Amino acid sequence: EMEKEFEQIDKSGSWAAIYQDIRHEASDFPCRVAKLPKNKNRNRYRDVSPFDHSRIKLHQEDNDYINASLIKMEEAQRSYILTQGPLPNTCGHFWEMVWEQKSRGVVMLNRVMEKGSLKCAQYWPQKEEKEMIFEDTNLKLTLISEDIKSYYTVRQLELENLTTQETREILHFHYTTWPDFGVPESPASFLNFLFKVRESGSLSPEHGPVVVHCSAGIGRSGTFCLADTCLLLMDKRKDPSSVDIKKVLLEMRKFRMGLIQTADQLRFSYLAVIEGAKFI
Ligand SMILES: [Mg+2]
Incomplete structure (x- = not known):
């Protein structure tokens, strides 16, 4: 389980080494157009x-x-x-x-x-x-x-x-x-908030993709998607204990950098998936 992988990380007091592992393994890809000098002022953060x-x-x-x-x-x-x-x-x-x-x-x-x-x-x-x-x-x-x-x-x-x-x-x-x-x-x-979004149909494929943001669009936004996806995958798979959060996070990171800005947010994501898993 992750319930017990989580408790191991707390006791071992090792959250920021886990999170640093995710950082190193994470995908890097070019951002050529983001960085054209004419789009400078279309970006909040360099x-x-x-x-x-x-x-x-x-x-x-x-x-x-x-x-x-x-x-x-x-x-x-x-x-x-x-x-x-x-x-x-x-x-x-x-x-x-x-x-x-x-x-x-x-x-x-x-x-x-x-x-x-x-x-x-x-x-x-x-x-x-x-x-x-x-x-x-x-x-x-x-x-x-x-x-x-x-x-x-x-x-x-x-x-x-x-x-x-x-x-x-x-x-x-x-x-x-x-x-x-x-x-x-x-x-x-x-x-609770996530379920309310779910309930609206706004995540459902009758529609185009939901647009999620905080100020940068990677920290709290990451948590939202990672929690949503991990739970869906827990609902779908023959073996729910098989969903790896780290694996899912790294997949999401193939598409946008930086998802989950802190080891806290990571702990928090683990946490929210486990608690969310008991409404199931
Ligand atoms: Mg009025």
Whole structure:
């Protein structure tokens, strides 16, 4: 089991050697286009960049870059787009992606301000009456409804393509309670939040991939996907004890760098899969 592989790592006090192992074994691939000098200001971080093979392109002749990777999990029949938190210049690109990738849910795992700095642009409308328009990508975004809770908030949003007059219902699943520092004491709210996303159909293949982000789109986002996928694979396989988290993490890392930024988040992911495994 991992229940008992986990308890071994605690007692041996060896979490950061495990996590460092994952780092060394991890895939490295080129990020040529992320690093073109014209996409400088499309990136929040000089050291978080999408691999070329797995990057999302914008359908437009001008410049097709966005900092977003498609994580494709063959066996679990799950796909995700991990991306950075929209910058003020990239909110339109962000909704273009949502539009073009035919996504149903956006999963956001940061507050707009954390530790006193801005971690993300306010990329969505706060009031029904005051809708956003992205002139660069000819999109309208309207807040239809909003349902706020202890550990998370959900929003019904309407996304109109102004070029073509078609509109679409996007679901905004905001996890609002990840602490500024470290990780949650228990993984129970986070799992709860994951199930709520699941319940919406936003992860299901009737739709294009969910778009998941924190500020960089690798830390908390990684945990979300890794926990979701590991549990699905636990549901599917003849032998559930066979799912290796380290193996699944390294697979996910073939598609985006950096997934799980700390040994804490790793412990936490293990943890959330084990606790999540008892709702089963
Ligand atoms: Mg009002």
